Amino acid sequence: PWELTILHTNDVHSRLEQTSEDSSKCVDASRCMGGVARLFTKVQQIRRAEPNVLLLDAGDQYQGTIWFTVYKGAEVAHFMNALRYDAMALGNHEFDNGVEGLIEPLLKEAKFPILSANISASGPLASQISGLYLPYKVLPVGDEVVGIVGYTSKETPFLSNPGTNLVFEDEITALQPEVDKLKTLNVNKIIALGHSGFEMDKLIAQKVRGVDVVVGGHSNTFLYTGNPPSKEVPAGKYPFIVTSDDGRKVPVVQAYAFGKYLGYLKIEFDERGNVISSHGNPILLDSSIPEDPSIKADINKWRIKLDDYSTQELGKTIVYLDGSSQSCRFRECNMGNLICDAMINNNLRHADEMFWNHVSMCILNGGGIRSPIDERNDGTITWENLAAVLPFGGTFDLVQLKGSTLKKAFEHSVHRYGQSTGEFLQVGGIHVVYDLSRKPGDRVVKLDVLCTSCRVPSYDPLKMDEVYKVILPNFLANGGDGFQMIKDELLRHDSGDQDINVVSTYISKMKVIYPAVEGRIKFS
Amino acid sequence: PWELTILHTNDVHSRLEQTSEDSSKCVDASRCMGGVARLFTKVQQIRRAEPNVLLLDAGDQYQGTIWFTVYKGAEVAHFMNALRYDAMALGNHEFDNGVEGLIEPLLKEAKFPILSANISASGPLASQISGLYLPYKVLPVGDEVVGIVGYTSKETPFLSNPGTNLVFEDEITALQPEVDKLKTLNVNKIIALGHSGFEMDKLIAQKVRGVDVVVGGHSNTFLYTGNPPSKEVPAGKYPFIVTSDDGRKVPVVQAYAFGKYLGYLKIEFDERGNVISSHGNPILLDSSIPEDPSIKADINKWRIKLDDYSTQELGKTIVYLDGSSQSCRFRECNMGNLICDAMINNNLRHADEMFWNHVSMCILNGGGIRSPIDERNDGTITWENLAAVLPFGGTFDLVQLKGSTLKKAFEHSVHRYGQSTGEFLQVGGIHVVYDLSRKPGDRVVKLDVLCTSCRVPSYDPLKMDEVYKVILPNFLANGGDGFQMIKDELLRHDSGDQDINVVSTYISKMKVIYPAVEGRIKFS
Ligand SMILES: O=C(O)CN(CC(=O)O)CC(=O)NCCNC(=O)[C@H]1O[C@@H](n2ccc(=O)[nH]c2=O)[C@H](O)[C@@H]1O
Ligand SMILES: O=C(O)CN(CC(=O)O)CC(=O)NCCNC(=O)[C@H]1O[C@@H](n2ccc(=O)[nH]c2=O)[C@H](O)[C@@H]1O
Ligand SMILES: [Ca+2]
Ligand SMILES: [Ca+2]
Ligand SMILES: [Cl-]
Ligand SMILES: [Cl-]
Ligand SMILES: [Zn+2]
Ligand SMILES: [Zn+2]
Ligand SMILES: [Zn+2]
Ligand SMILES: [Zn+2]
């Protein structure tokens, strides 16, 4: 048999440095995990031991920490080049800074092929970008070749800023003819590498004839065979085996997110490129694996510009930004309003004639707001100030919730009101009125929401059967602070931009801010 | 006697072109008035006839039309230079584009002295600006000299954008020692030329010893001796005679605004510089005086860049901007909200630790909103589109109103509701609730206003005895659409920036707008 070792990462999300166990800032260095220096150590060890290795990224290196804010993708090109990645698929967050912010820092500087078979361009953009990403690449591996075929979420226009000169085609439609074409070119070992989520990954494995292995991302899917090595709970075995429409067994892999694990799959192929066997497991990059000293020293060099940036003025406030718990856990607070207005602003995407914007609504638990910002420092706001408000290294995510689920969340918001608990909700695009003299679970007496499918935004009563888009912290999407109804009842969940970066972008755009408390939340 | 002819303008406010009778756009050319070409004709005729002439401007050439938007003061330097003005005093609107927007276009390019004795600078600004404006200038006139001493409203920090490195001193305090100094220098004929308003002009005439004549502005004061030649109603005789604390009769003049009239005062002096007699009258610059063809042709040349600018994209909207009368005369409309939010934004000035901003409140009659803007032209908004919404050539002014006066205005807003009448009020920083089943004059059931003297802006009930600052159209400050209570009861009124320019600046700053209808006005 001819044996190939596939090493793979996905949704690294700017975790260039080692992190805590939960992927937020490293505090206790001796129990920290991930980061590119440690990844370098483990990839170099595997390349010493195994003759045929590919190192692949399934997209979403962009967006997640101050690294991306400051270096805008140049850190991705530089450090992925240092690790000698073999190929990368485009993820949705690679379009966060528009097509221009992808061509220049990443497409022009990467030393490896960047792939997506289902993205087409038209007009002058088509000539500008031609060949800078590719539908696939054939790579020599020892005395063999392997075809790698890319794909990117069709939902990217709702999740990022690709512009209106790119079209995201159905993945399976776009992929099949490229895989058929590779077969005519005597390429019998084919990896589909892409960024659409585990459910779509399984469909590609099932339906795209001639794919031998699917290496995915986007859904942050953790798969494991055996007892798991950390806190992540497996969604299935690694690899997850799909029985294809042509009768083959096709392994599907993913490796969680944030650079915490290195995916590792060993495939044995026969001479005609059929998969004889597949086995492996993601490797937890914990503190037992040393950081490579050379990469670590380059990281510490690049950190200087970050530390400088962190104390620069982003913008000014002329009002006190009240993120005190005595306000934000008991009533509408103007820090909560600022943060939700920034969330909505970050999620302005290109629209149909059927909506002014696809999302208008925001919720934010008051327990997530961790500091005020005083306006008396000449009004200045810095990244460092925002990091005190939003210290958990979260994201502001897009979900779909039925009205009944949202009413349940608002009842939960006040179920034990008066104890300074974290679940009290700050809001945007929602006007709620509570009557606290009513029994827990029956205290919401009015709940109106801003329309999306309307040319003039205005408020209407919340409808129990209608499904609403809502921007909220990943902590809430995951059921934190007791919002189990959100985790259990949501219809869709996509991970969004870094919390601090959403607020910092909005402050920088506005220049001078003055958020008021204006009646979004009232008590009767 | 030695006879001096003083020609004077004030508060021209960017009326470089001839205007209608009411100072808005010229429609019927053969009955149009003012403009610099016609002014040139009349000044040149007077200079042929009278040997000793000074042509003076008492400030506020800046701000008022698209001329100022595009040329930013370069049009003022150029055309005031072409008319060979002798001196100008700084007005409040000369600081609309900051100190930098006054030094460069105006101070560096004017060929005549620009004066203010009561403005001091500190820090590096003091060295940058030293001698670019002067407390006074001594001018030769025939074989004599005349001293001209400038002054500028002490309220300029609340009316414009002078920055925090300029200090506006009390006028009389600053003026007296400069006038005493001119007397030691054998200058016995002294004109105080300045921009503080007719009431302060009379105080200077009364109290500043040795001033022979006061030439003022800011209050748009029309003075006339005899039957008046147009629609303006005189506030007093021209000149208005003040009996000074040292026993002299001191003439005080002003000449309305907008370039409609040329002030003309003839003074006879004895050999020691005492005023023997004063008489004259503003001259209405009507169509019987021809436009100078050379100046007119230069005006038409400079107009090209205006016409080009008028169709340029200022910014984008992703929502329909509903300025229809069926919305804005019956309920909260999102064009009204946009326009009021722009008004408040235009009136952000440097604040004390005693307020977040000195003004938070806005009213706008729905009859003043004259078009919607469709968002389906790729979202683009142009100046030309804004001119359709706001076609009257007005300003957004600052007034002080007791709460009782404002409650009366809100009752007037709905006194005959249902007829599509113009007085229905759009708002900012105010939340009103009407009950239309109540009798006219008793339909306002809740009226809450955004605080100013607070670090976190929030809403409280309106207090009948408290005096509120409010930004509103000059049409309303003047009692239009039946708001006689505003005209009759207001405590303070200062004229503000051009209506279209306030909105265009705000759109350009925001880049992408999406105003909602959000509950500022409700019916119960
Ligand atoms: O926040 C508290 O009530 C607990 N405290 C109070 C304090 O710090 O003064 C101490 C503490 O240990 N807090 C750190 C962990 N966070 C929380 O306990 C609360 O903070 C919020 N939280 C925590 C983690 C997170 O990722 N997101 C988030 O919103 C939740 O509302 C949660 O209830
Ligand atoms: O506006 C109307 O109801 C009268 N119309 C209706 C229409 O044009 O379809 C005709 C008209 O002659 N209008 C021009 C003059 N303006 C007005 O009559 C109304 O427009 C508003 N107006 C007028 C002049 C002004 O300077 N500011 C201002 O707000 C007032 O609400 C006033 O009631
Ligand atoms: Ca094969
Ligand atoms: Ca004298
Ligand atoms: Cl999925
Ligand atoms: Cl006055
Ligand atoms: Zn991701
Ligand atoms: Zn993704
Ligand atoms: Zn003026
Ligand atoms: Zn003025």
PDB file of N, CA, C and O in Angstrom, chain B residues 265-319:
ATOM      1  N   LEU B 265     -23.631 104.953   6.044  1.00  0.00           N
ATOM      2  CA  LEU B 265     -23.748 105.953   7.128  1.00  0.00           C
ATOM      3  C   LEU B 265     -22.753 107.057   6.802  1.00  0.00           C
ATOM      4  O   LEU B 265     -21.557 106.807   6.647  1.00  0.00           O
ATOM      5  N   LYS B 266     -23.219 108.298   6.786  1.00  0.00           N
ATOM      6  CA  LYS B 266     -22.321 109.453   6.618  1.00  0.00           C
ATOM      7  C   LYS B 266     -22.089 110.145   7.936  1.00  0.00           C
ATOM      8  O   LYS B 266     -23.080 110.491   8.624  1.00  0.00           O
ATOM      9  N   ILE B 267     -20.824 110.308   8.321  1.00  0.00           N
ATOM     10  CA  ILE B 267     -20.428 110.888   9.628  1.00  0.00           C
ATOM     11  C   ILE B 267     -19.653 112.176   9.386  1.00  0.00           C
ATOM     12  O   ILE B 267     -18.724 112.176   8.571  1.00  0.00           O
ATOM     13  N   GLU B 268     -20.009 113.266  10.069  1.00  0.00           N
ATOM     14  CA  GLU B 268     -19.161 114.439   9.964  1.00  0.00           C
ATOM     15  C   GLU B 268     -18.426 114.574  11.292  1.00  0.00           C
ATOM     16  O   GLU B 268     -19.040 114.438  12.359  1.00  0.00           O
ATOM     17  N   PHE B 269     -17.123 114.750  11.201  1.00  0.00           N
ATOM     18  CA  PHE B 269     -16.243 114.898  12.371  1.00  0.00           C
ATOM     19  C   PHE B 269     -15.661 116.306  12.412  1.00  0.00           C
ATOM     20  O   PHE B 269     -15.399 116.931  11.352  1.00  0.00           O
ATOM     21  N   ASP B 270     -15.464 116.807  13.633  1.00  0.00           N
ATOM     22  CA  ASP B 270     -14.704 118.032  13.792  1.00  0.00           C
ATOM     23  C   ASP B 270     -13.242 117.680  13.793  1.00  0.00           C
ATOM     24  O   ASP B 270     -12.863 116.479  13.696  1.00  0.00           O
ATOM     25  N   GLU B 271     -12.386 118.703  13.953  1.00  0.00           N
ATOM     26  CA  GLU B 271     -10.934 118.503  13.862  1.00  0.00           C
ATOM     27  C   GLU B 271     -10.307 117.669  14.995  1.00  0.00           C
ATOM     28  O   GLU B 271      -9.212 117.154  14.837  1.00  0.00           O
ATOM     29  N   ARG B 272     -11.018 117.519  16.105  1.00  0.00           N
ATOM     30  CA  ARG B 272     -10.576 116.768  17.262  1.00  0.00           C
ATOM     31  C   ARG B 272     -11.233 115.375  17.211  1.00  0.00           C
ATOM     32  O   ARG B 272     -11.135 114.638  18.165  1.00  0.00           O
ATOM     33  N   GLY B 273     -11.935 115.065  16.127  1.00  0.00           N
ATOM     34  CA  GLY B 273     -12.527 113.699  16.023  1.00  0.00           C
ATOM     35  C   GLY B 273     -13.822 113.499  16.766  1.00  0.00           C
ATOM     36  O   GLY B 273     -14.215 112.341  17.020  1.00  0.00           O
ATOM     37  N   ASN B 274     -14.507 114.594  17.117  1.00  0.00           N
ATOM     38  CA  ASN B 274     -15.882 114.453  17.613  1.00  0.00           C
ATOM     39  C   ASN B 274     -16.918 114.382  16.518  1.00  0.00           C
ATOM     40  O   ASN B 274     -16.808 115.043  15.486  1.00  0.00           O
ATOM     41  N   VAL B 275     -17.928 113.555  16.746  1.00  0.00           N
ATOM     42  CA  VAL B 275     -18.963 113.356  15.753  1.00  0.00           C
ATOM     43  C   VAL B 275     -19.920 114.568  15.874  1.00  0.00           C
ATOM     44  O   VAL B 275     -20.531 114.774  16.938  1.00  0.00           O
ATOM     45  N   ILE B 276     -19.970 115.364  14.809  1.00  0.00           N
ATOM     46  CA  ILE B 276     -20.885 116.508  14.662  1.00  0.00           C
ATOM     47  C   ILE B 276     -22.266 116.062  14.240  1.00  0.00           C
ATOM     48  O   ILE B 276     -23.247 116.583  14.735  1.00  0.00           O
ATOM     49  N   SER B 277     -22.366 115.123  13.282  1.00  0.00           N
ATOM     50  CA  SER B 277     -23.656 114.632  12.784  1.00  0.00           C
ATOM     51  C   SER B 277     -23.468 113.230  12.182  1.00  0.00           C
ATOM     52  O   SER B 277     -22.349 112.876  11.782  1.00  0.00           O
ATOM     53  N   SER B 278     -24.556 112.462  12.156  1.00  0.00           N
ATOM     54  CA  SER B 278     -24.550 111.119  11.493  1.00  0.00           C
ATOM     55  C   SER B 278     -25.889 110.934  10.829  1.00  0.00           C
ATOM     56  O   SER B 278     -26.916 111.300  11.398  1.00  0.00           O
ATOM     57  N   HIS B 279     -25.922 110.418   9.591  1.00  0.00           N
ATOM     58  CA  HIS B 279     -27.213 110.104   9.012  1.00  0.00           C
ATOM     59  C   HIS B 279     -26.975 109.068   7.885  1.00  0.00           C
ATOM     60  O   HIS B 279     -25.870 108.997   7.326  1.00  0.00           O
ATOM     61  N   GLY B 280     -28.016 108.331   7.528  1.00  0.00           N
ATOM     62  CA  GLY B 280     -27.915 107.467   6.375  1.00  0.00           C
ATOM     63  C   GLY B 280     -29.025 106.468   6.400  1.00  0.00           C
ATOM     64  O   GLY B 280     -30.120 106.762   6.941  1.00  0.00           O
ATOM     65  N   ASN B 281     -28.838 105.334   5.742  1.00  0.00           N
ATOM     66  CA  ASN B 281     -29.843 104.282   5.680  1.00  0.00           C
ATOM     67  C   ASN B 281     -29.226 103.124   4.888  1.00  0.00           C
ATOM     68  O   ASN B 281     -28.430 103.414   3.943  1.00  0.00           O
ATOM     69  N   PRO B 282     -29.599 101.899   5.230  1.00  0.00           N
ATOM     70  CA  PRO B 282     -29.194 100.791   4.345  1.00  0.00           C
ATOM     71  C   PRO B 282     -29.841 100.973   2.951  1.00  0.00           C
ATOM     72  O   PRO B 282     -31.000 101.466   2.843  1.00  0.00           O
ATOM     73  N   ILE B 283     -29.118 100.547   1.903  1.00  0.00           N
ATOM     74  CA  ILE B 283     -29.617 100.640   0.524  1.00  0.00           C
ATOM     75  C   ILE B 283     -30.047  99.240   0.068  1.00  0.00           C
ATOM     76  O   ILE B 283     -29.241  98.285   0.094  1.00  0.00           O
ATOM     77  N   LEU B 284     -31.317  99.108  -0.327  1.00  0.00           N
ATOM     78  CA  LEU B 284     -31.789  97.812  -0.816  1.00  0.00           C
ATOM     79  C   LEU B 284     -31.124  97.538  -2.178  1.00  0.00           C
ATOM     80  O   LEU B 284     -31.185  98.369  -3.084  1.00  0.00           O
ATOM     81  N   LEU B 285     -30.452  96.412  -2.263  1.00  0.00           N
ATOM     82  CA  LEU B 285     -29.724  96.064  -3.542  1.00  0.00           C
ATOM     83  C   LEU B 285     -30.750  95.310  -4.427  1.00  0.00           C
ATOM     84  O   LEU B 285     -30.674  94.080  -4.564  1.00  0.00           O
ATOM     85  N   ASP B 286     -31.671  96.051  -5.026  1.00  0.00           N
ATOM     86  CA  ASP B 286     -32.693  95.390  -5.844  1.00  0.00           C
ATOM     87  C   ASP B 286     -32.287  95.409  -7.318  1.00  0.00           C
ATOM     88  O   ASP B 286     -31.191  95.882  -7.673  1.00  0.00           O
ATOM     89  N   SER B 287     -33.204  94.902  -8.166  1.00  0.00           N
ATOM     90  CA  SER B 287     -32.878  94.667  -9.568  1.00  0.00           C
ATOM     91  C   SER B 287     -32.658  95.941 -10.385  1.00  0.00           C
ATOM     92  O   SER B 287     -32.135  95.873 -11.522  1.00  0.00           O
ATOM     93  N   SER B 288     -33.020  97.107  -9.850  1.00  0.00           N
ATOM     94  CA  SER B 288     -32.743  98.355 -10.518  1.00  0.00           C
ATOM     95  C   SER B 288     -31.254  98.662 -10.576  1.00  0.00           C
ATOM     96  O   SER B 288     -30.834  99.526 -11.398  1.00  0.00           O
ATOM     97  N   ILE B 289     -30.446  97.988  -9.730  1.00  0.00           N
ATOM     98  CA  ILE B 289     -28.979  98.190  -9.762  1.00  0.00           C
ATOM     99  C   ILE B 289     -28.414  96.999 -10.577  1.00  0.00           C
ATOM    100  O   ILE B 289     -28.651  95.837 -10.256  1.00  0.00           O
ATOM    101  N   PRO B 290     -27.687  97.275 -11.679  1.00  0.00           N
ATOM    102  CA  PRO B 290     -27.276  96.101 -12.492  1.00  0.00           C
ATOM    103  C   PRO B 290     -26.170  95.276 -11.833  1.00  0.00           C
ATOM    104  O   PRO B 290     -25.364  95.835 -11.111  1.00  0.00           O
ATOM    105  N   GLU B 291     -26.129  93.961 -12.079  1.00  0.00           N
ATOM    106  CA  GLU B 291     -24.971  93.206 -11.694  1.00  0.00           C
ATOM    107  C   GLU B 291     -23.730  93.612 -12.470  1.00  0.00           C
ATOM    108  O   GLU B 291     -23.805  93.598 -13.740  1.00  0.00           O
ATOM    109  N   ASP B 292     -22.605  93.842 -11.796  1.00  0.00           N
ATOM    110  CA  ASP B 292     -21.361  94.142 -12.575  1.00  0.00           C
ATOM    111  C   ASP B 292     -21.024  92.972 -13.514  1.00  0.00           C
ATOM    112  O   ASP B 292     -20.893  91.846 -13.079  1.00  0.00           O
ATOM    113  N   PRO B 293     -20.817  93.241 -14.836  1.00  0.00           N
ATOM    114  CA  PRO B 293     -20.677  92.073 -15.726  1.00  0.00           C
ATOM    115  C   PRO B 293     -19.423  91.259 -15.453  1.00  0.00           C
ATOM    116  O   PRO B 293     -19.437  90.015 -15.636  1.00  0.00           O
ATOM    117  N   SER B 294     -18.304  91.887 -15.054  1.00  0.00           N
ATOM    118  CA  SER B 294     -17.063  91.193 -14.805  1.00  0.00           C
ATOM    119  C   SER B 294     -17.192  90.276 -13.575  1.00  0.00           C
ATOM    120  O   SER B 294     -16.807  89.124 -13.614  1.00  0.00           O
ATOM    121  N   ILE B 295     -17.731  90.832 -12.483  1.00  0.00           N
ATOM    122  CA  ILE B 295     -17.914  90.009 -11.283  1.00  0.00           C
ATOM    123  C   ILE B 295     -18.905  88.872 -11.627  1.00  0.00           C
ATOM    124  O   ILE B 295     -18.668  87.749 -11.193  1.00  0.00           O
ATOM    125  N   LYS B 296     -20.010  89.154 -12.304  1.00  0.00           N
ATOM    126  CA  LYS B 296     -21.013  88.145 -12.650  1.00  0.00           C
ATOM    127  C   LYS B 296     -20.362  87.029 -13.452  1.00  0.00           C
ATOM    128  O   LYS B 296     -20.592  85.843 -13.224  1.00  0.00           O
ATOM    129  N   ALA B 297     -19.482  87.398 -14.386  1.00  0.00           N
ATOM    130  CA  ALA B 297     -18.879  86.339 -15.179  1.00  0.00           C
ATOM    131  C   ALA B 297     -17.932  85.463 -14.352  1.00  0.00           C
ATOM    132  O   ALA B 297     -17.840  84.249 -14.585  1.00  0.00           O
ATOM    133  N   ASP B 298     -17.213  86.038 -13.391  1.00  0.00           N
ATOM    134  CA  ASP B 298     -16.366  85.277 -12.503  1.00  0.00           C
ATOM    135  C   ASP B 298     -17.218  84.375 -11.611  1.00  0.00           C
ATOM    136  O   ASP B 298     -16.871  83.219 -11.414  1.00  0.00           O
ATOM    137  N   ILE B 299     -18.333  84.905 -11.105  1.00  0.00           N
ATOM    138  CA  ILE B 299     -19.300  84.076 -10.322  1.00  0.00           C
ATOM    139  C   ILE B 299     -19.706  82.863 -11.174  1.00  0.00           C
ATOM    140  O   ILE B 299     -19.670  81.708 -10.649  1.00  0.00           O
ATOM    141  N   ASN B 300     -20.125  83.099 -12.440  1.00  0.00           N
ATOM    142  CA  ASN B 300     -20.585  81.971 -13.285  1.00  0.00           C
ATOM    143  C   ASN B 300     -19.473  80.976 -13.545  1.00  0.00           C
ATOM    144  O   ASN B 300     -19.745  79.769 -13.600  1.00  0.00           O
ATOM    145  N   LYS B 301     -18.224  81.444 -13.609  1.00  0.00           N
ATOM    146  CA  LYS B 301     -17.081  80.516 -13.730  1.00  0.00           C
ATOM    147  C   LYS B 301     -16.957  79.623 -12.490  1.00  0.00           C
ATOM    148  O   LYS B 301     -16.834  78.408 -12.582  1.00  0.00           O
ATOM    149  N   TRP B 302     -17.014  80.253 -11.326  1.00  0.00           N
ATOM    150  CA  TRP B 302     -16.846  79.526 -10.061  1.00  0.00           C
ATOM    151  C   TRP B 302     -18.043  78.580  -9.830  1.00  0.00           C
ATOM    152  O   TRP B 302     -17.883  77.549  -9.096  1.00  0.00           O
ATOM    153  N   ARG B 303     -19.179  78.870 -10.444  1.00  0.00           N
ATOM    154  CA  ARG B 303     -20.377  78.029 -10.258  1.00  0.00           C
ATOM    155  C   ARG B 303     -20.172  76.630 -10.841  1.00  0.00           C
ATOM    156  O   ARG B 303     -20.863  75.660 -10.425  1.00  0.00           O
ATOM    157  N   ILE B 304     -19.236  76.479 -11.770  1.00  0.00           N
ATOM    158  CA  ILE B 304     -19.141  75.160 -12.439  1.00  0.00           C
ATOM    159  C   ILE B 304     -18.867  74.052 -11.464  1.00  0.00           C
ATOM    160  O   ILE B 304     -19.515  72.981 -11.552  1.00  0.00           O
ATOM    161  N   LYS B 305     -17.869  74.251 -10.589  1.00  0.00           N
ATOM    162  CA  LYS B 305     -17.480  73.288  -9.540  1.00  0.00           C
ATOM    163  C   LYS B 305     -18.645  73.024  -8.584  1.00  0.00           C
ATOM    164  O   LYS B 305     -18.798  71.868  -8.114  1.00  0.00           O
ATOM    165  N   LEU B 306     -19.495  74.017  -8.353  1.00  0.00           N
ATOM    166  CA  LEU B 306     -20.714  73.785  -7.528  1.00  0.00           C
ATOM    167  C   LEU B 306     -21.664  72.799  -8.179  1.00  0.00           C
ATOM    168  O   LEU B 306     -22.212  71.860  -7.515  1.00  0.00           O
ATOM    169  N   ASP B 307     -21.920  73.039  -9.468  1.00  0.00           N
ATOM    170  CA  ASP B 307     -22.870  72.214 -10.218  1.00  0.00           C
ATOM    171  C   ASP B 307     -22.291  70.796 -10.239  1.00  0.00           C
ATOM    172  O   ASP B 307     -23.067  69.799  -9.992  1.00  0.00           O
ATOM    173  N   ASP B 308     -20.982  70.659 -10.479  1.00  0.00           N
ATOM    174  CA  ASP B 308     -20.329  69.293 -10.458  1.00  0.00           C
ATOM    175  C   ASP B 308     -20.533  68.611  -9.078  1.00  0.00           C
ATOM    176  O   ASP B 308     -20.915  67.445  -9.002  1.00  0.00           O
ATOM    177  N   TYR B 309     -20.349  69.365  -7.994  1.00  0.00           N
ATOM    178  CA  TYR B 309     -20.370  68.817  -6.650  1.00  0.00           C
ATOM    179  C   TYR B 309     -21.795  68.313  -6.327  1.00  0.00           C
ATOM    180  O   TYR B 309     -21.948  67.311  -5.575  1.00  0.00           O
ATOM    181  N   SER B 310     -22.776  69.040  -6.842  1.00  0.00           N
ATOM    182  CA  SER B 310     -24.182  68.811  -6.473  1.00  0.00           C
ATOM    183  C   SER B 310     -24.680  67.409  -6.845  1.00  0.00           C
ATOM    184  O   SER B 310     -25.653  66.942  -6.285  1.00  0.00           O
ATOM    185  N   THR B 311     -24.015  66.758  -7.800  1.00  0.00           N
ATOM    186  CA  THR B 311     -24.462  65.411  -8.160  1.00  0.00           C
ATOM    187  C   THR B 311     -23.510  64.292  -7.727  1.00  0.00           C
ATOM    188  O   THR B 311     -23.718  63.099  -8.107  1.00  0.00           O
ATOM    189  N   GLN B 312     -22.508  64.613  -6.891  1.00  0.00           N
ATOM    190  CA  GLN B 312     -21.553  63.644  -6.384  1.00  0.00           C
ATOM    191  C   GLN B 312     -22.176  62.841  -5.221  1.00  0.00           C
ATOM    192  O   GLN B 312     -23.002  63.357  -4.456  1.00  0.00           O
ATOM    193  N   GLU B 313     -21.813  61.569  -5.124  1.00  0.00           N
ATOM    194  CA  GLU B 313     -22.253  60.810  -3.937  1.00  0.00           C
ATOM    195  C   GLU B 313     -21.671  61.361  -2.620  1.00  0.00           C
ATOM    196  O   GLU B 313     -20.455  61.496  -2.477  1.00  0.00           O
ATOM    197  N   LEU B 314     -22.535  61.668  -1.620  1.00  0.00           N
ATOM    198  CA  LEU B 314     -22.096  62.128  -0.317  1.00  0.00           C
ATOM    199  C   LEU B 314     -21.943  60.918   0.625  1.00  0.00           C
ATOM    200  O   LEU B 314     -21.134  60.919   1.545  1.00  0.00           O
ATOM    201  N   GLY B 315     -22.736  59.878   0.353  1.00  0.00           N
ATOM    202  CA  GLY B 315     -22.806  58.731   1.273  1.00  0.00           C
ATOM    203  C   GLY B 315     -23.890  57.825   0.730  1.00  0.00           C
ATOM    204  O   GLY B 315     -24.488  58.092  -0.301  1.00  0.00           O
ATOM    205  N   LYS B 316     -24.239  56.797   1.503  1.00  0.00           N
ATOM    206  CA  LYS B 316     -25.247  55.846   1.086  1.00  0.00           C
ATOM    207  C   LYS B 316     -26.308  55.606   2.165  1.00  0.00           C
ATOM    208  O   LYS B 316     -26.044  55.722   3.329  1.00  0.00           O
ATOM    209  N   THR B 317     -27.512  55.286   1.711  1.00  0.00           N
ATOM    210  CA  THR B 317     -28.543  54.752   2.605  1.00  0.00           C
ATOM    211  C   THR B 317     -28.899  53.339   2.161  1.00  0.00           C
ATOM    212  O   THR B 317     -29.054  53.047   0.968  1.00  0.00           O
ATOM    213  N   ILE B 318     -29.067  52.462   3.159  1.00  0.00           N
ATOM    214  CA  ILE B 318     -29.642  51.136   2.875  1.00  0.00           C
ATOM    215  C   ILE B 318     -31.133  51.050   3.195  1.00  0.00           C
ATOM    216  O   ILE B 318     -31.763  49.937   3.032  1.00  0.00           O
ATOM    217  N   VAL B 319     -31.752  52.145   3.678  1.00  0.00           N
ATOM    218  CA  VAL B 319     -33.190  52.147   3.896  1.00  0.00           C
ATOM    219  C   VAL B 319     -33.853  53.242   3.011  1.00  0.00           C
ATOM    220  O   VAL B 319     -33.217  54.294   2.674  1.00  0.00           O
TER     221      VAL B 319
END
